[PDB]
Amino acid sequence: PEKIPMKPLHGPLYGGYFRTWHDKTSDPTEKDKVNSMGELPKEVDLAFIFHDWTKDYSLFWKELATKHVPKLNKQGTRVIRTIPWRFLAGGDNSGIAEDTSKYPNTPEGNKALAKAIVDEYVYKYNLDGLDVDVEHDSIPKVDKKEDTAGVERSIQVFEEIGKLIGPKGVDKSRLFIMDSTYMADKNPLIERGAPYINLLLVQVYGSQGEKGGWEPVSNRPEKTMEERWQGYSKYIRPEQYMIGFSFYEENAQEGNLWYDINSRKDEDKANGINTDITGTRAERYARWQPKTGGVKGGIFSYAIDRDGVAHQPKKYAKDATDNIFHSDYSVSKALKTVMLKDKSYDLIDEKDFPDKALREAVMAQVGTRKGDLERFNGTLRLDNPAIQSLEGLNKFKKLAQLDLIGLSRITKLDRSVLPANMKPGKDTLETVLETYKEEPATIPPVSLKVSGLTGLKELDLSGFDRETLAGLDAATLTSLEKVDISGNKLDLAPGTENRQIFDTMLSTISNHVGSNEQTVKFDKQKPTGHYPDTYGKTSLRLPVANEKVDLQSQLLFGTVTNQGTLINSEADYKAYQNHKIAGRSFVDSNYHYNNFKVSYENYTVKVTDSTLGTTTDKTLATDKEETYKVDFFSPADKTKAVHTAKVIVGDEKTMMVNLAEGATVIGGSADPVNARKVFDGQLGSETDNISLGWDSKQSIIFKLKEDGLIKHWRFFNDSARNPETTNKPIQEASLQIFNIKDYNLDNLLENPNKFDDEKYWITVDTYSAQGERATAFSNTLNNITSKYWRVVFDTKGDRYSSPVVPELQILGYPLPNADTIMKTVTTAKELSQQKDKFSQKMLDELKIKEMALETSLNSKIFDVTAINANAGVLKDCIEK
Numbered sequence: 001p002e003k004i005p006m007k008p009l010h011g012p013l014y015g016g017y018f019r020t021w022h023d024k025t026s027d028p029t030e031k032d033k034v035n036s037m038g039e040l041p042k043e044v045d046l047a048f049i050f051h052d053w054t055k056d057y058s059l060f061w062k063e064l065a066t067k068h069v070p071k072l073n074k075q076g077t078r079v080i081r082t083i084p085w086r087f088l089a090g091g092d093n094s095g096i097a098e099d100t101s102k103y104p105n106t107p108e109g110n111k112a113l114a115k116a117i118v119d120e121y122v123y124k125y126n127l128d129g130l131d132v133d134v135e136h137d138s139i140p141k142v143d144k145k146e147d148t149a150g151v152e153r154s155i156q157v158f159e160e161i162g163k164l165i166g167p168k169g170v171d172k173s174r175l176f177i178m179d180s181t182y183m184a185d186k187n188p189l190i191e192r193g194a195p196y197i198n199l200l201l202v203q204v205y206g207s208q209g210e211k212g213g214w215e216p217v218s219n220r221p222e223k224t225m226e227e228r229w230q231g232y233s234k235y236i237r238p239e240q241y242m243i244g245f246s247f248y249e250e251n252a253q254e255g256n257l258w259y260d261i262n263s264r265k266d267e268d269k270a271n272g273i274n275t276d277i278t279g280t281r282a283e284r285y286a287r288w289q290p291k292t293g294g295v296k297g298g299i300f301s302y303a304i305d306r307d308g309v310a311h312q313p314k315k316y317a318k319d320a321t322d323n324i325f326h327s328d329y330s331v332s333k334a335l336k337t338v339m340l341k342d343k344s345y346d347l348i349d350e351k352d353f354p355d356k357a358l359r360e361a362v363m364a365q366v367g368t369r370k371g372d373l374e375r376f377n378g379t380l381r382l383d384n385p386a387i388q389s390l391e392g393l394n395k396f397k398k399l400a401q402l403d404l405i406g407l408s409r410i411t412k413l414d415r416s417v418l419p420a421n422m423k424p425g426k427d428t429l430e431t432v433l434e435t436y437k438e439e440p441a442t443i444p445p446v447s448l449k450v451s452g453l454t455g456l457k458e459l460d461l462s463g464f465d466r467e468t469l470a471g472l473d474a475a476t477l478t479s480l481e482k483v484d485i486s487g488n489k490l491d492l493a494p495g496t497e498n499r500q501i502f503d504t505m506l507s508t509i510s511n512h513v514g515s516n517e518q519t520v521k522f523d524k525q526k527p528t529g530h531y532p533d534t535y536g537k538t539s540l541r542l543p544v545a546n547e548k549v550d551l552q553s554q555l556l557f558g559t560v561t562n563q564g565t566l567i568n569s570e571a572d573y574k575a576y577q578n579h580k581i582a583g584r585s586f587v588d589s590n591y592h593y594n595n596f597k598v599s600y601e602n603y604t605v606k607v608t609d610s611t612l613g614t615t616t617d618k619t620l621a622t623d624k625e626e627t628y629k630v631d632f633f634s635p636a637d638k639t640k641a642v643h644t645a646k647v648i649v650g651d652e653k654t655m656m657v658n659l660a661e662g663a664t665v666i667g668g669s670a671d672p673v674n675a676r677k678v679f680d681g682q683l684g685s686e687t688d689n690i691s692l693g694w695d696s697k698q699s700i701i702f703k704l705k706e707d708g709l710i711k712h713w714r715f716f717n718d719s720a721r722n723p724e725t726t727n728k729p730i731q732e733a734s735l736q737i738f739n740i741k742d743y744n745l746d747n748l749l750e751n752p753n754k755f756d757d758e759k760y761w762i763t764v765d766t767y768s769a770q771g772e773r774a775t776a777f778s779n780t781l782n783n784i785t786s787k788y789w790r791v792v793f794d795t796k797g798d799r800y801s802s803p804v805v806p807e808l809q810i811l812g813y814p815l816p817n818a819d820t821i822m823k824t825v826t827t828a829k830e831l832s833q834q835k836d837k838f839s840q841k842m843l844d845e846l847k848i849k850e851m852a853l854e855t856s857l858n859s860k861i862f863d864v865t866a867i868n869a870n871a872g873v874l875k876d877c878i879e880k
């Protein structure tokens with residue numbers, strides 16, 4: 001039949017999914033189906049056809065096209081064909097797209113598929129639009145496997161369909177609709193599909209759709225109703241957004257029980273009808289509006305053939321409501337009535353914006369509903385010079401950006417003609433949804449840009465707590481005769497951008513009517529205190545004394561304004577407090593240093609000494625001569641330093657390096673793979689098996705990587721990695737170097753585990769645990785130069801008390817030929833004890849060159865060049 005013309009879509013809308021297998025004409029076999037899709041009331045704006053694609057129902061499609069559609073159109077109801085996502089791709093159950101012959105994955109093939117799709121599902125029965133179901137159940141598949149190529153192809157075709165129908169199509173009278181279960185960032189079709197659709201329908205069935213899901217790990221609601229909208233707010237307009245609940249489907253199973261309408265009473269066994277809307281999730285969905293952006297397009301219901309049917313009680317999730325009922329659609333009519341009482345959908349009129357040019361701009365850029373003014377958080381640009389009055393701007397509650405451009409007829413700017421969110425504030429919009437507990441979100445103040453207002457005589461921005469004056473093109477405000485920027489948070493110190501803008505306005509005013517206390521106001525400012533991006537004090541030299549030092553207060557300090565003004569101390573702020581403009585300060589009298597300064601109270605430190613020993617104490621004792629590296633951390637990020645400084649107590653000592661990191665395990669009675677983990681440079685993961693062996697006494701024979709002079713060593717207990725360790729700490733320990741003087745190195749390498757015995761080695765230090773808890777042990781070493789080492793750990797407990805050592809550090813400074821340098825300095829000592837062989841005068845000259853080398857070897861500032869020189873002087877002196 002010929003298509004009855006219908007008025008353009010105008011929300012708030014009600015949609016409904018009518019399942020085809022519940023229309024009388026669908027299956028003549030049964031008679032329990034007493035419902036008809038043509039019986040849907042005028043209250044329904046969108047009648048969706050949800051079909052069982054395995055069924056034929058040829059009698060239904062005829063009834064639909066010839067009787068249902070004319071009846072529904074005449075009352076103003078549109079009929080939309082719902083097709084699966086996979087119908088746009090190919091593969092399993094893809095309908096038309098199964099025939100790859102006529103519709104290949106080509107540009108012209110996709111273009112042909114799009115035409116065939118609208119031909120078959122839209123125009124064939126003269127329907128009012130196409131609805132694409134995009135969810136997991138409708139995903140493109142090939143042999144039951146999800147197909148990326150299919151999904152990617154379905155992004156096209158969709159674009160091609162959109163060129164035929166929808167707001168960007170040839171036939172705009174046909175709607176193009178996407179319904180989905182996905183979030184925007186999980187919907188691969190929304191980004192390129194959104195410009196082609198009229199409406200986006202989100203399925204939010206059940207309490208999980210309403211409240212969102214409770215995420216276990218975070219102790220916080222995820223995927224909430226507001227988050228879902230916010231995700232799609234990037235792609236569509238609020239008026240295109242429709243949320244959905246579900247009626248009770250007969251014989252519904254677990255996973256399909258939503259309870260979006262009132263359940264059956266646990267005693268009323270003979271009744272399956274409950275047309276009451278009171279307390280339902282559907283009634284709450286009808287009244288729900290987004291907090292930002294604007295008012296929604298409306299709501300929709302699934303299984304609208306089950307309208308009026310009570311839900312099966314939750315107690316029976318493993319009935320009278322499972323019978324088939326003849327619906328009169330009371331619930332649908334009731335919900336549409338609720339949405340029509342929503343005053344949010346009242347049109348923005350001349351009362352809101354008396355100026356026609358302004359009213360037009362708002363209607364184009366924001367919306368047409370009064371409730372959009374409460375929610376719009378985008379950008380309103382006013383660059384139409386015709387605008388004579390800004391009356392109505394105060395109606396904006398959440399506006400993000402306002403551009404006043406070239407409006408040369410405006411003579412005054414104040415709070416009465418500016419957005420209500422000029423000053424800070426919280427969300428006042430009430431919530432209608434159930435929650436798991438609603439903390440009022442912070443409404444960001446509107447960013448204001450004013451340029452070209454050449455007729456502006458008064459500018460009043462007082463008492464808005466404005467953070468900055470950025471946006472004011474003061475040079476263009478040539479008619480200014482009065483200004484008031486007092487009572488904000490502006491930093492008006494000289495050299496700042498805020499000051500530049502103010503001075504320009506001041507100059508204009510002085511020339512016009514003269515600058516006085518009634519034409520120029522700027523005081524009572526409370527500038528915000530911020531953390532500096534960088535810190536200047538990277539070095540601190542302290543004398544050796546019996547004093548404790550607060551590292552934070554001496555290295556990590558300072559508060560900066562958003563204009564760049566850095567205040568490092570109360571003295572700096574006092575100098576800031578008497579910055580004068582026209583003889584008086586701009587800073588509020590009650591805004592003191594403690595009110596302005598940021599707090600470093602919860603910052604943490606990491607102090608590393610020259611032996612690479614670490615502490616986390618913010619207080620440093622200067623009773624010992626030591627050089628430190630100090631890292632500072634913010635509470636927000638404990639693994640990333642906001643500032644690094646060097647602290648030198650007494651004479652500076654060069655920072656040592658772990659010469660044992662990356663060493664090679666050669667032997668020793670220990671797990672060779674875990675033994676390598678004491679040299680990896682980390683404490684390891686708590687979950688990692690790091691035990692050296694089974695016996696309580698394990699040993700490790702290893703080789704260093706770089707020639708160096710060893711001056712220290714350190715090993716950690718398991719408690720350094722895990723404070724709650726059950727592993728027994730190391731009781732006895734020995735650090736050893738190879739006895740290369742009395743034994744052959746070659747024998748050691750060819751068979752290492754034969755030399756896993758003390759006699760082949762020389763103990764250079766011994767550790768005996770005192771008893772108290774200790775995360776590590778460290779000790780000094782007297783200039784050791786051995787490439788090959790041996791270490792023995794022992795917990796001295798029972799067996800199965802494995803020696804657990806997260807790291808072994810052998811510290812010192814890099815020095816090539818260190819082994820040889822110590823040879824010639826050792827020979828110098830040997831010859832000095834041969835007093836029967838050389839004269840005292842020959843020895844005294846030698847001792848000078850000997851004590852010259854030792855001084856450079858033990859020099860606090862480690863000089864490799866000087867060491868080489870003093871070693872060369874000595875070696876030539878020993879020859880002969």
Ligand SMILES: [Ca+2]
Pocket residue numbers: 677678679680681682683684806807
């Ligand atoms: Ca380790």
